[PDB]
């Protein structure tokens, strides 16, 4: 039938005190590199945090985000160890309500940041979490930005849209590897740290469970 | 990989004001018969409502429930058009925390009620919604008993446990058909009104999305 | 996918001036024998006319009907050239809201009538339209009894329930042939005069187009 | 045999008080995007509404329509949240009585409207239901324009012709996806919200059930 | 599709001056033996001539006929060189309007007559055309008894019913051979003198061309 | 063996009171479009009516005809609702006694007429039965022109020759579809309203039943 | 083994009162067209009649013949309804004692005559039996010219040589069809009126039965 | 080659300050049930803790252990929420230095404990962690008993021997499931919480990485 | 599943008294040539010793190392019989945290040293251990540089990063052989002296056992 990876979650919209989000049951192990990929259907052009990882000592261990410029250009952001959000624009025009595959590749070892839109590299950036190692026990939240383990959400920092096929590796994937990940008919690799629908997560505040039609109709 | 039908939802436990539940996005069409089957892992012996269907004029259109006696005997209940809960005991000893397949078959045409535990018939009952037709637009909630469309939940009426493979037909399946439905390796039929993971639903109050290991390890 | 023969029509219920029914676009050719088979899910125990054939000179050319006794016994009736309804009971207990296959075999040549329930013979009767030939141009209506071409319906003569797989031959099928017709996984023969979903018909007064789950779930 | 998707409905013609139409049994879930495709054989050049969706608070939630210019040019229209009918002409000459595949793609997220004729894009339009979300519970009627849930039809707004293969998604399909939908021998995708012959509907006022010969003879 | 051998002809009924019949275009060669087999659906119990062969010098060269007794017993008759009709009864009860396979085997060499009903021998008779040889040029008529080449029909001698699979050999087939001929799924042998639908014939006076459902539904 | 579609009928010649023809047992349903195709072997150059459809109110509902000019050019004619015979010449030289495939495509919806000779389009014509709908119950006669249901034939309007593979659709086939119909080795499509040898017809006045050798020797 | 179609007959030579010939047991049905093909090995250059057809009223219904010019050119002749022998020469040099395939195609409908040598057309001729129809009951003789049914032979009109594969159709085959007939390894079509070795014939006056080595050695 | 599941770890022996052990990188999610299976080669008969799970608030969340009686009987122990070690003896004689498959199945829901030796059930016990839920974030250590997260080891509580194929589920496997797990050539199921060699772990104090020869030589 | 060769070890980082390393259980046999290949993910640019071999009489029998220049150039070093570290730079830019395949080929017979990066030769060097033979009994340590059998580690000489697929031969592989070794999808050759995961080794001081994603995702 439908592949379990085609399951999607809808993040309707946020307005205090309702904060639709997902919280992964099991925290992350300590890591020195991290690659987060997923298919997203953005609802707004304004900045929103998609993947948020926090520990008791640091609520901003690792946070991915995006926003669309006026011309429609996609902009992927990343923040490590509470640094400022680093952005890299992608040569692709975003149409709210449409599907796109996005990856954020980070390496604390050399401090390099690289983002991808639909399997292609948009560019890279230096000095992003250089020498930093995310402490063991990070809690992951999707759709909201944590200011506290599993909470302290701000509505202007939430992300609304549809999401599916979230795959996370504790390695910094290569340009060729990422392309095989974004591919709809490839082998469809699975993250070793988090594999969509293979790692239980908590659903709260009205997120909608449905089916993504990006890859298959 | 894993079949999308093996996805399960955990209903942690209920305590005002937190009521873990699922609400199906699309309401049901009018029906004269209804068959609801699913795999459940009960957490408590006390009565709990699993499948709740309500319309503006009647919050108790159709409600399934269960409870376990002291000797461990399973008891499946059904309520139609706000009748009293009708119960039929099953010749099977329930162990909280273990998986079981259960079906509730109702026919407003002749007013017959029949329940099944693991593909086998437990017994039938007469005069249950005889002549009744559920009005179009019923809202379905899983894990809580509605006293209002999508709400008005009571904690002593909630149902805690794990659930998966929810299949619903607007027909009254036969004894042979039900057996093919409960089978783990059969053809695994899909409900025509609601097919698990094929009909979007809203998740709220901390339900946990995971994977059922009843059929496959 | 689903076989087009599994399409079903629901006849909700009749109450002046609403008469749910089907009227076949093309009239029947003259015949001397006729076999009408179909799958039915009866809603009431009282007499109802299923297949009605009328010509300008005779509104009661050929009419099939059924009713269920108090003990649940099925009774199939037939009327030819405005004779009285001839009935033959079947050794099967009917449960309103459940599916059954039924055939009416008539031969004006020898005047014999034979009915079948689920591919098996219930019995036969003599002197039913003996020597009669249905005149060319008969109009066929399903669910209502014509007192006029395509009309003049009476509520107490209507038939409510679900129907599918209507097959009609201008020959008097044999006992062995009938059994192959009723079979769900056989060759599934098609009528040469009327073949379900292959001969267009008019739908009126709220009949519901759906899918029969008798043969396949 | 014939694929169940080749079943067609004929909308004979409308004249008070007879309004041939179809009403889907189950209402639609709330949506933010919607794609409606189907094969049509138009009988008149004048404007007619094909797909009509209404809720208690808004009878004009979503309505598709078409008309043919004097030179024969096809014009597909769309109306969202009671806006004015937006039209986009297609570079194709229509011959009444012939088959054509048509899709209407709408996205309330960015407010974009796009129409397709025979799998090809005719053009797009902005500001059509921008920011609008169709409320849960929409009733769908085919062939007539609702001014009230399931009724309030106007003859000059009806649509006569033959229709089949109605597929509806709660997503805004892409240009490439649409082409795979229109194709007669492709995979023939099925809508996730409404799939022709898989979602029961009520037939009234003389619609004719037949077989479409567009794809296969 | 349907095998051309399943084509059937209906002989409605005879009443001066209308005599439904078939006349084979090509006359028969001289013969000393002849076997005529066919599937028939008799309409009346009274005597009727099925196969009639006549030459200018003898209108009664070879004529087959049948009639049913009161008890329903079949009786096959044969007449050679204007002898009296010889009859042989068959241990089978005939039901007018039903199909049966019948063969008439004649040998002028030894003067033996043998008839078969459904591939089985009913009995034989001596001194029937012993030493007789049908002269070349016999005209064959089906359904009527010739008193003149291709004419001079008498209504009380006509045969009404349905007929198909007419096979004629200029040899006297064996008991085993006949059984293979009557078989519906055997090899279905074809006559060497006349092969149904392979030897053109003239149709007159309202015979009806249709399809036999004896062998296949 | 030989395909049942290769059966042919010979229309010897007409001379009062003998009018060789065929009359289809079952009348046609009401239609708004009609396509009639068949293989013909014309015997004369003068006008002859091939397909004649009549109702009690109109004996000239639909009539096809042909004639050959002096230069041998084929001319196909059509008449709807007693209009004048519309003719379209075909760029092909006819040799009496030879086989040709011919189709007449009519659409009352737009009033267009199109004819084909051997799968190719000869041309089209406007305003032919524009807005007309053939009333239900049309009687079809082949070889003669009805001035009364099933009768009132005129010899100078009869058509002599050989005919086979008569296929009739209640739709107006496309140019590509027609080509697949005329093809001898294609899929050989079958008409949905009338399928040669699949819809019984009455044979009268000496028509000859034989086998067409157009497609196969 | 050897195909029965390779059987050949030798016509030694004629001299009163010995006339080697073949007479077909069964006479021909009435025809309006006729195609006669066969493989011949001519022994003399002088005119000889190969295929002779006669009825009581006309001994020269249809007669084929040939002769070879001094330069060796083949000349095929035909005579219908006692017309004069029409000849068409073939661009091929004949060597007495060698094999050749020959066809005579005649159409009384348009009066056209066409001959073929080795599957290729030699030419055609008009006004040959135009409007003529061979009466039913023609007797066929091979090797001699009848002046009376089955007799009245003249030596100077006989034809000596070897012959095989005689195929006769009551249709006027096309140029392409003829070529498939002459081919030794094609499908080897069989005549529908007379098929070599499938239609019994009388052998008299010393004809020799052997095997043709034209097609296979 | 060798299956990655056949990798084994040797726990040499413990003596302050050297404590050979394994610490899983990623902590466990909250659980209500837990099944831990693995292949072990015990070195001593005295009590040793194999699987130790601790959280900041409770160092004895879940601990498995074993010891061998003097007669050689195996004894499997379990401790939940700092209860006393519960033991169940197995009807199998242990030989130090040999391989055995062992599973510990615990369910906090009903408080039942069950142990298995080589895929077979040894017995069960009640009231073991009844109503207890292990808090999220448990740290897992193999070979040593934690008195503090990842430390506070005691020599007399260590476990020496060889271990491999550690599989852990957050469900309470059934008797039949367990047997499929212990099987060497079965499907070899993998734990969903911890899968040997698929979930990184820290190795310290001289553990030896080698290859298990229990299943394959 | 995953190939056992994809197992990797992480060397976290070194700081007295913690020295993460691996010590192979079985010492090496005497050798005159040695080839050491493995996949490495370096964490620092500064010099680190990867493979260290020592005997009681010589702690620096054979030691491999690497460092990265400021421009990112890779530099592979080798030391034999306590010579000075010989370095050869590779035309490849190293990115800390990324995977690379590296081989060190040494031959005491001719004293030649050759290094490879990703299966390609970087260059060679002479006079490196020329005439030297490593004495039997060498102890191998990975990640630390021995100054004593299995110990005497210095932090500034340690190597941090991830490593897998360690293969060692007592022969000096050729350029072509090396390339087949580095290949991810080749035959993946195994060392004859040490084969990753096939020769047991001791793990100490927090090395992490995980899975390499260089070759497969
Ligand atoms: Ca924060
Ligand atoms: Ca924040
Ligand atoms: Ca903030
Ligand atoms: Ca309630
Ligand atoms: Ca309540
Ligand atoms: Ca209550
Ligand atoms: Ca009536
Ligand atoms: Ca009535
Ligand atoms: Ca009445
Ligand atoms: Ca409206
Ligand atoms: Ca309106
Ligand atoms: Ca209006
Ligand atoms: Ca007679
Ligand atoms: Ca007579
Ligand atoms: Ca008589
Ligand atoms: Ca007329
Ligand atoms: Ca006329
Ligand atoms: Ca006239
Ligand atoms: Ca003559
Ligand atoms: Ca002569
Ligand atoms: Ca002469
Ligand atoms: Ca402890
Ligand atoms: Ca302790
Ligand atoms: Ca202790
Ligand atoms: Ca050293
Ligand atoms: Ca050192
Ligand atoms: Ca040093």
Could you please report the per-residue DSSP string of chain F? --BGGGEEEEE---BTTB--EEEESSPBPPBSEEEEEEEEEE--SS-EEEEEEEETTEEEEEEEEEEE-TT-EEEEEEEETT-PPEEEEEEEE--TTS-EEEEEEEETTTTEEEEEETTEEEEEES-SSTT--BPS-BEEEESS--SBTTB---GGG---EEEEEEEEESS---HHHHHHHH-SSS-----SSEETTTS-EEEESSEEEEE--SS--
All residues with CB under 5 Å from ion ligand 23:
H 145, 147, 154
Q: What is the DSSP letter of G193?
A: S
φ, ψ of residue B82 to 5 degrees: the values are 60, 30
Angstrom CA distances, C80 to C111, C142, D183, E97, stand at 10, 16, 49, 17
For B182, list phi and psi in degrees, rounded to 5. Answer: -70, -25
The residues that bridge with E195 in the sheet, in sequence order, are E167
Give the span between the Cα atoms of H49 and H153, in whole angstroms: 11
Q: What is the DSSP letter of G176?
A: H
CA distance B134 to B54: 9
Angle at A211 between CA A209 and CA A216, to 5 degrees: 170
Q: With DSSP H G I counted as helix, E B as strand and the rest as coil, what are the percentages for chain D, rounded to 5? A: 5, 50, 45
User: What are A86's strand-pairing partners?
Assistant: A78
Residues of B with CB under 8 A from a CB of H: 43, 95-98, 211, 213, 217
Q: How many CB pairs under 8 A join E and F?
A: 71
Residues with Cβ–ion distance below 5 A, ligand 10: D 59-60, 147
Q: Where are the alpha helices (DSSP H) in I57-170?
A: none
- For residue B179, give the 3-state DSSP assignment: helix
The Cβ-side half-sphere exposure at I159, using a 13 Å CA radius, reads 27
Residue B27 is given by DSSP the state P
- CA nearest to F180 within chain D: D217
Each as own residue / partner, the long-range contacts of residues C88-94 (CB below 8 Å, 24 or more positions apart, any chain) are: C88/C113, C88/C114, C88/C115, C88/C122, C88/C123, C88/C124, C88/C125, C89/C122, C89/C123, C90/C115, C90/C117, C90/C122, C90/C123, C91/C122, C92/C117, C92/C118, C92/C122, C94/C42, C94/C45, C94/C68
Contact A95, A40 (CB under 8 A): no
Chain D CB contacts of C197 below 8 Å = 2, 7, 209, 211
Phi/psi of residue H108, nearest 5 degrees: -70, -20
Q: How far apart are the first and last CA of chain E?
A: 12
Q: How far apart are CA D188 and CA D211, in angstroms?
A: 17
A65: helix, coil or strand? Answer: strand
As for how many domains chain C has, the answer is 1
Instruction: Give the span between the Cα atoms of I133 and I109, in whole angstroms.
Output: 8
User: What is the SS3 assignment for D15-60?
Assistant: ECCECCEEEECCCECCECEEEEEEEEEECCCCCEEEEEEEECCEEE
Q: What is the CATH number of the domain that holds D185?
A: 2.60.120.200
> How many CB atoms neighbour CB G207 within 10 A?
18
Is F155 a known ligand-binding residue? no
Record the tokens describing residue E205, joined without a space.
């006076």
Residues of F in contact with E211 (CB under 8 A): 197-198, 200
Distance between CA atoms of B112 and B127, rounded to whole angstroms?
A: 6
Residue F189, min C-alpha distance to chain D (Å): 6
| DSSP annotation string for F136-167 | S-BEEEESS--SBTTB---GGG---EEEEEEE
Residue pair H93/H86 in contact (Cβ under 8 Å)? The answer is: no
CA distance C210 to C9: 6
Say how far apart CA C14 and CA C156 lie, in whole Å. 8
Over its C-alpha atoms, chain B yields an Rg (Å, rounded) of 16
In total, chain F counts a number of residues equal to 217
Q: Do B169 and C98 touch (CB under 8 A)?
A: no
Residues of the binding site of H: 59-60, 145-147, 154, 157
Phi then psi dihedrals of residue F110, to 5 deg: -110, -5
Please tell me which chains touch E, using 3 or more CB pairs under 8 Å as the contact test.
Answer: C, F, G
In angstroms, the CA E136 to CA E113 distance is 21
Task: Find where tokens 């006559």 sit.
Answer: E191
Tokens matching residue G133: 């129809």
* Closest residue of chain E to F11, computed from CA coordinates: E202
Six-digit token pair at B29?
């069409």
The C-alpha angle F160, F165, F166, rounded to 5 degrees, equals 75
CA distance A135 to chain I (A): 13
Query: Whole-angstrom Cα distance, residue D165 to residue D205?
Result: 21
Q: From the list A97, A211, A217, which residue is nearest D110 (CB)?
A: A97
Residues in a beta bridge with I210: I8
| Element of type H or E holding H73 | strand H73-80
Backbone torsion region of residue C165, taken as left when φ is above 0, otherwise alpha when ψ lies between -120 and 50, otherwise beta: left
First to last CA, chain D: 12
Signed CA dihedral, C10, C14, C19, C22: sign only = positive
Ligand nearest to the CA of C148: 7
Contact criterion met (CB < 8 Å) for G27 and E137:
yes
Count of CA atoms in the C-beta half-sphere (13 A) of A121: 11
CA distance B103 to B116: 5
Q: Which ligand is nearest to the CA of I146?
A: 25
CA end-to-end span of chain G: 12
Q: What's CA A42's distance to the chain center, in Å?
A: 12
Nearest to G158 by CA among G142, G174, G134, G180: G142
Distance of CA F152 to the CA centre of its chain: 19
Chain D residue numbers with beta carbons less than 8 Å from the beta carbon of B28 are 26
* Distance separating alpha carbons of residues B138 and D3, to the nearest angstrom: 32
**Cβ atoms of residues E194 and E169 within 8 Å:** no
Do F and B touch, counting CB pairs below 8 Å (3 needed)?
no
**B59 labeled part of a ligand binding site:** yes
Residue I168's φ and ψ, nearest 5 degrees, are -135, 130
Resolution (A): 2.7
Cα separation, A72 vs A89, whole angstroms: 11
Instruction: Please say whether the beta carbons of I146 and I21 come within 8 A.
Output: no
CA angle at residue D115 from D114 to D119, to 5 degrees? 120
Per CB-CB distance under 8 Å, the chain G contacts of E27 are: 26-27, 29, 136-137
Which of these, H199, H29, I213, lies nearest to A105 by C-alpha position? I213
Contact yes or no for H40/H188 (Cβ under 8 A): no
Nearest in space to D216 (alpha carbons), one of D192, D188, D194: D188
Domain of residue D133 covers 1-217
Method by which the coordinates were obtained: X-ray
The number of beta carbons lying within 10 Å of the beta carbon of residue C193 is: 21
CA distance G108 to A142: 89
Looking at beta carbons, which residues of chain F come within 8 Å of C34?
none
Q: Ligand 27 centre from I144 Cα, in Å?
A: 11
DSSP classification of residue C109? T
Q: How far is the CA of C203 from the centre of ligand 7 (A)?
A: 20
Centroid of ligand 24 to alpha carbon of H46 (angstroms): 14
- Nearest CB to D172; choose among A43, A98, A217: A98
D191-203 in b/e burial notation, b at 16+ Cβ within 10 A? bbbbbbbbbbbbb
SS3 B6: helix
- CB–CB of D211 and F189 under 8 A? no
Report how far residue C206's alpha carbon sits from residue I188's, in angstroms, rounded to the nearest whole number: 70
At H212, give phi and psi (nearest 5°).
-75, 130
Nearest ligand, measured from the Cα of B147: 4
Query: Which residue of B lies nearest to D29 if distances are taken between CA atoms?
Result: B26
């Amino acid at each position: 039938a439908v592949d379990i990876r085609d399951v999607k979650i809808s993040f309707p919209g946020t307005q205090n005190p309702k904060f639709p989000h997902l919280r992964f049951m099991q925290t992350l192990p300590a890591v020195r590199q991290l690659t987060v990929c997923q298919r997203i259907k953005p609802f707004h052009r304004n900045t929103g945090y998609i993947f948020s990882c926090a520990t008791s000592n640091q609520d901003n261990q690792f946070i991915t985000s995006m926003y669309v410029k006026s011309d429609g250009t996609l902009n992927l952001g990343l923040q490590v160890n509470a640094s400022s959000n680093k952005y890299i624009s992608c040569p692709i025009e975003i149409e709210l309500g449409q599907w796109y595959h996005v990856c954020h590749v980070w390496s604390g070892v050399d401090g390099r940041m690289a983002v991808y839109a639909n399997g292609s590299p948009c560019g890279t950036m230096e000095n992003v979490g250089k020498g930093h190692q995310i402490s063991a026990g990070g809690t992951v939240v999707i759709g909201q930005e944590q200011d506290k383990i599993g909470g302290g959400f701000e509505e202007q920092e939430s992300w609304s849209g549809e999401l599916s096929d979230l795959q996370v590796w504790d390695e910094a994937l290569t340009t060729h590897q990422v392309s095989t990940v974004a591919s709809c008919n490839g082998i469809r690799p699975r993250g070793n740290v988090i594999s969509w629908m293979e790692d239980s997560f908590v659903a709260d505040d009205g997120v909608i469970v449905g089916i993504s039609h990006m890859c298959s109709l």
